[PDB]
């Protein structure tokens, strides 16, 4: 098997970096420009290295609010997994340091913007266009599941577009190395798996559930389960009934039924062949899986670029002051970071 030697060689490089362990650089060496995104624990800005001149995407996390919400386990897993993995569809990490008040991570800047901002403007992507992006998630999940890793957060808000129209997966805040089961509640309400809501101890099969919700939102323009209150969305997820649009192809409908199967016995990705069932499907018939990994397939849509450092493909936000105190905030907790 060709991919078996690939996943065996990839599991040797990942575990070598997994035990290689901090404070690569410092905040004084960056020029903050504009904010690219915001979250509950911090924001993501566009920074330029004052000396090297390269533009980067600095992710800031407040050390006090993370401790106040018991997110130290998820914080250490985001940094420990990012710098260890190596895949063309995963975002790259450069510098990781910390000061008195905030944790900092410096990633590869992806100026093409989110898939959310591009999907919401067009309305919906065509099935060949959707098959192009859906094929990259298959090879990415295949690589991550071989390392006993789970993502638990697949949504257009965490999928970026590079200079060649390919996907750059970011936001590893919910990544975790799990062999067996895990019992942590996390994800996106419109993308949560049924067993995650039922507190049933889920495995790597929840990433395949979010894959079906992702393809449905790209080909239609809305998730199959959505409403005002999150309790209304949960009533649709655990129900197991899905209403498909009319413009869907029947091969797309059948693949979504096998992926959105609330029954773990008949859900794709978690069977005998596993990921092989998704590649040999009638939908991914003309898909060149090797050329997708080699980035040789032509991109159907490439975003507009004004050079490195162009925040045109990112929505505007309100700028604030980066608050860095003089006192060390929870220094004993963030030591392995």
């Amino acid at each position: 098997e060709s991919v078996k030697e690939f996943l065996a060689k990839a599991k040797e490089d990942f575990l070598k970096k997994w035990e290689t362990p901090q404070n690569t650089a410092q905040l004084d060496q960056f020029d903050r420009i504009k904010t690219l995104g915001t979250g509950s624990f911090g924001r993501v800005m566009l920074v330029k290295h004052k000396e090297s001149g390269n533009h980067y995407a600095m992710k800031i996390l407040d050390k006090q609010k993370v401790v106040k919400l018991k997110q130290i386990e998820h914080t250490l897993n985001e940094k420990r997994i990012l710098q260890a993995v190596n895949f063309p569809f995963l975002v790259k990490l450069e510098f990781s340091f910390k000061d008195n008040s905030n944790l900092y991570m410096v990633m590869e800047y992806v100026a093409g913007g989110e898939m959310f901002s591009h999907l919401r403007r067009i309305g919906r992507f065509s099935e060949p266009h959707a098959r192009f992006y859906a094929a990259q998630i298959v090879l990415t999940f295949e690589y991550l599941h071989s390392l006993d890793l789970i993502y638990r957060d697949l949504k257009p808000e965490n999928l970026l577009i590079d200079q060649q129209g390919y996907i750059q997966v970011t936001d590893f805040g919910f990544a975790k190395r799990v062999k067996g089961r895990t019992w942590t509640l996390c994800g996106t309400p419109e993308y949560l798996a049924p067993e995650i809501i039922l507190s049933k101890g889920y495995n790597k099969a929840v990433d395949w559930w979010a894959l079906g919700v992702l393809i449905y939102e790209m080909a239609a323009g809305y998730p199959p389960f959505f409403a005002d209150q999150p309790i209304q969305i949960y009533e649709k997820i655990v129900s197991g009934k899905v209403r498909f649009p009319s413009h869907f192809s029947s091969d797309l409908k059948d693949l979504l039924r096998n992926l959105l199967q609330v029954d773990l016995t008949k859900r794709f990705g978690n069977l005998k062949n596993g990921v092989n069932d998704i590649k040999n499907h009638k939908w991914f018939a003309t898909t060149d899986w090797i050329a997708i990994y080699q980035r040789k397939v032509e991109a159907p849509f490439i975003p507009k670029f004004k050079g490195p450092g162009d925040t045109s493909n990112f929505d505007d936000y309100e700028e604030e002051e980066i608050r860095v105190s003089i006192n060390e905030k929870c220094g004993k907790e963030f030591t392995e970071f």
């Binding site: 998820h74 919910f174 509640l185 996390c186 309400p189």
Partner: peptide, 12 residues
């Protein structure tokens, strides 16, 4: 017009 509201992640 289009109000592109981004979805956040739920914890706890």
């Amino acid at each position: 017009t289009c109000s592109a509201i981004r979805r956040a992640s739920t914890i706890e």
